[PDB]
Amino acid sequence: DVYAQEKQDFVQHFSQIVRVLTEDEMGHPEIGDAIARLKEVLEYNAIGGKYNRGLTVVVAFRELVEPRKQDADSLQRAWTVGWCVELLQAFFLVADDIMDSSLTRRGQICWYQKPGVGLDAINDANLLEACIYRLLKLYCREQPYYLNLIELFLQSSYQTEIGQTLDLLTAPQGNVDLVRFTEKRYKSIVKYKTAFYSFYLPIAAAMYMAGIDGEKEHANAKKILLEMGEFFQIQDDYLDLFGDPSVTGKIGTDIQDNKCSWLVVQCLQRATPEQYQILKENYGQKEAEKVARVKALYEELDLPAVFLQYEEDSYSHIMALIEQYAAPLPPAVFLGLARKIYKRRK
Amino acid sequence: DVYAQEKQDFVQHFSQIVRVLTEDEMGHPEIGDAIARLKEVLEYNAIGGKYNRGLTVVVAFRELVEPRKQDADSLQRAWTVGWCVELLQAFFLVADDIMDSSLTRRGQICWYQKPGVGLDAINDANLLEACIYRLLKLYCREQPYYLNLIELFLQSSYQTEIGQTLDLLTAPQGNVDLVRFTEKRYKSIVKYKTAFYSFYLPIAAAMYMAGIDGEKEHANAKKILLEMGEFFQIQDDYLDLFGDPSVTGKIGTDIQDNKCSWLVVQCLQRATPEQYQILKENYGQKEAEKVARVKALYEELDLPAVFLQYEEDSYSHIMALIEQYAAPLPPAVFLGLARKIYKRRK
Ligand SMILES: CC(C)Oc1ccc(-c2ccnc(NC(P(=O)(O)O)P(=O)(O)O)c2)cc1
Numbered sequence: 001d002v003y004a005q006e007k008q009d010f011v012q013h014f015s016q017i018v019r020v021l022t023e024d025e026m027g028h029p030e031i032g033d034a035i036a037r038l039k040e041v042l043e044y045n046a047i048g049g050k051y052n053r054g055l056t057v058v059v060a061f062r063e064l065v066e067p068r069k070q071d072a073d074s075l076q077r078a079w080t081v082g083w084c085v086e087l088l089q090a091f092f093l094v095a096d097d098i099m100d101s102s103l104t105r106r107g108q109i110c111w112y113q114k115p116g117v118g119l120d121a122i123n124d125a126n127l128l129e130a131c132i133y134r135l136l137k138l139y140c141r142e143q144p145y146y147l148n149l150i151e152l153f154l155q156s157s158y159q160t161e162i163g164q165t166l167d168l169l170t171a172p173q174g175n176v177d178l179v180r181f182t183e184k185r186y187k188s189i190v191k192y193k194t195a196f197y198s199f200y201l202p203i204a205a206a207m208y209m210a211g212i213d214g215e216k217e218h219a220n221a222k223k224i225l226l227e228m229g230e231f232f233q234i235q236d237d238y239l240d241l242f243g244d245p246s247v248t249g250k251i252g253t254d255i256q257d258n259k260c261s262w263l264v265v266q267c268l269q270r271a272t273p274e275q276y277q278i279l280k281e282n283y284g285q286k287e288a289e290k291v292a293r294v295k296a297l298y299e300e301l302d303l304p305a306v307f308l309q310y311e312e313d314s315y316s317h318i319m320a321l322i323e324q325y326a327a328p329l330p331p332a333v334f335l336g337l338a339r340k341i342y343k344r345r346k
Numbered sequence: 347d348v349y350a351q352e353k354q355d356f357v358q359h360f361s362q363i364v365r366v367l368t369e370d371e372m373g374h375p376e377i378g379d380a381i382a383r384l385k386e387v388l389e390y391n392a393i394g395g396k397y398n399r400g401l402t403v404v405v406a407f408r409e410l411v412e413p414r415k416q417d418a419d420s421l422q423r424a425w426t427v428g429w430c431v432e433l434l435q436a437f438f439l440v441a442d443d444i445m446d447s448s449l450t451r452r453g454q455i456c457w458y459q460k461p462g463v464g465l466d467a468i469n470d471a472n473l474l475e476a477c478i479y480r481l482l483k484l485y486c487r488e489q490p491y492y493l494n495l496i497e498l499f500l501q502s503s504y505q506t507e508i509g510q511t512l513d514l515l516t517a518p519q520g521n522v523d524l525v526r527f528t529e530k531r532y533k534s535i536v537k538y539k540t541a542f543y544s545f546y547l548p549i550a551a552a553m554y555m556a557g558i559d560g561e562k563e564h565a566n567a568k569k570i571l572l573e574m575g576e577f578f579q580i581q582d583d584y585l586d587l588f589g590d591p592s593v594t595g596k597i598g599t600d601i602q603d604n605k606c607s608w609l610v611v612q613c614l615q616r617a618t619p620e621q622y623q624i625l626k627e628n629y630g631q632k633e634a635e636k637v638a639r640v641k642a643l644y645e646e647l648d649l650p651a652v653f654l655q656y657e658e659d660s661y662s663h664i665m666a667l668i669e670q671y672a673a674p675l676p677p678a679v680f681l682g683l684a685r686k687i688y689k690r691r692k
Pocket residue numbers: 091092093095096100160161164193194236240468469472473
């Protein structure tokens with residue numbers, strides 16, 4: 001409910017983000033066409049999601065900063081930093097969709113699949129990343145936490161890219177990769193590719209903005225948040241195959257793309273030798289009938305039911321971590337995030 | 347000669363760069379495979395060039411810092427910042443080669459063309475970019491110019507990406523784009539895509555490291571350097587078609603790629619209406635015989651000789667700018683760069 005309360009306000013501020021990021025068209029008109037492109041890229045790729053990561057910045061800031069310190073300018077900085085996290089997500093998704101051969105995202109054709117865009121989307125993606133640091137400069141440069149935020153975003157990006165490296169290394173095209181698909185490898189991939197930027201980053205950013213800079217407070221927050229991120233990525237992998245695409249907004253490519261998904265890991269742990277062979281002959285290939293055979297195997301092994309049980313046990317574990325590590329931060333900071341992600345269908 | 351003096355020392359420090367960037371394999375072994383990938387990406391893509399941009403940092407630092415202040419640790423910071431510029435170049439080239447459909451670079455097949463790499467090179471490129479900020483943290487975080495360097499690299503990246511946007515917008519695949527190929531557009535593209543990061547960045551970085559942070563000194567340096575960058579990109583465009591590939595290390599794709607090259611701009615200024623039509627029917631297309639026809643037109647219009655004359659007049663103009671704007675910096679700082687770029691065959 002705390003996310004829904006802030007959502008309209010948050011999305012309304014996108015206009016101002018776009019206006020501020022396109023405002024150099026005024027002083028350097030020679031870059032006009034490029035700024036028009038950047039606006040198109042922002043409108044297509046930074047809108048249409050759920051805004052969970054950016055909204056988390058704003059909700060956390062409200063909960064962590066004394067209300068007498070939530071002046072107009074401070075709140076605007078908070079909505080701007082939330083939008084920075086959304087721009088990071090947009091950078092990542094544009095590039096990921098290329099690398100994953102994806103078709104749709106957030107209910108529309110991926111940006112790179114648009115006629116006339118193609119591999120120029122590489123540059124578009126990187127432009128989105130640059131916009132983060134332009135926003136941080138424009139709004140936060142005189143604040144004591146400016147450097148902490150720059151470094152947090154840079155570090156989060158590095159960690160995420162390292163995860164993406166592990167994801168791509170574990171999933172080579174055209175090679176049987178089943179031996180590589182272990183729980184230990186899975187946990188390492190998702191910690192780096194998803195958990196740092198999707199969970200630690202937004203809460204950390206709010207913490208820094210609230211003046212909470214201590215190593216121990218950041219570490220304790222991290223303990224909760226990285227585990228939440230692991231669950232989130234497990235959910236994401238489950239939904240890639242079993243999610244309703246009218247809800248998720250995107251077609252799944254994990255099977256065709258040979259990915260170390262939580263699904264294929266759980267399949268491997270349960271498979272008879274005959275099933276192992278079915279998996280080997282059908283995984284990591286573009287043929288629709290081979291993708292169908294893998295899904296049928298997962299259903300044979302009751303993986304949906306194993307997921308539902310896992311979601312229950314994971315929720316309980318994260319709540320136990322909140323009891324242990326939330327203090328001295330309000331537990332509502334973590335509880336509002338848990339509510340948002342658990343039982344998520346998108 | 348000042349570049350040759352520093353070159354061996356500079357390249358010898360690459361081992362240490364790689365060692366420092368791969369040293370977290372020790373403390374977080376779960377990312378071992380990713381760090382092994384990053385090492386392969388660094389070895390393939392950050393070596394084999396001329397190192398002009400990174401060496402410029404080191405030469406400038408030597409010339410701008412009092413010799414009694416060039417202690418071991420300071421010099422190491424200077425070689426590290428030079429390598430940061432080289433890593434930026436490597437990020438850019440890996441991604442550019444994808445976007446331009448290039449075949450070779452620095453004498454070998456482009457990284458993305460390597461079997462088993464492909465569009466995973468998108469992530470590789472971005473990893474190179476992240477390494478810049480990891481190096482700046484590791485070596486320069488306690489220095490008074492740390493924030494100035496972070497912001498300079500971020501800004502240079504943004505400007506470069508804006509230029510790349512103009513480059514791609516002006517060169518749409520499959521569309522006749524001749525009307526867009528003007529001198530004014532050309533000058534704007536190359537200022538952003540090349541001149542900021544290739545000329546202003548390395549000298550500015552050295553300036554900041556020497557404690558020269560003034561807006562006016564940075565502006566005057568910029569006046570020289572952006573014009574030098576324009577010449578450099580004109581040279582690059584000339585060499586794309588007329589350079590010896592055994593020297594340049596890369597096959598030209600500007601004609602096939604529909605680019606706003608200096609060549610096609612100069613062609614348009616000189617072309618009869620019949621020649622205009624030959625250009626229209628043959629430019630921006632992959633057919634080798636059509637590329638051949640454009641080259642033959644350029645030679646008919648004596649464009650090599652127009653380039654040689656342009657190089658002479660440009661050299662004189664840049665030298666006049668040095669006389670005007672070098673002070674109070676040593677003119678050798680700019681003169682050593684001019685010597686390196688003029689009469690360049692690579
Ligand atoms: C430089 C750029 C390539 O770096 C990144 C780009 C994208 C990502 C990333 C991280 C986490 N999730 C995604 N996307 C998900 P999604 O496609 O949204 O289901 P995944 O492909 O991992 O299943 C992408 C991480 C890094």
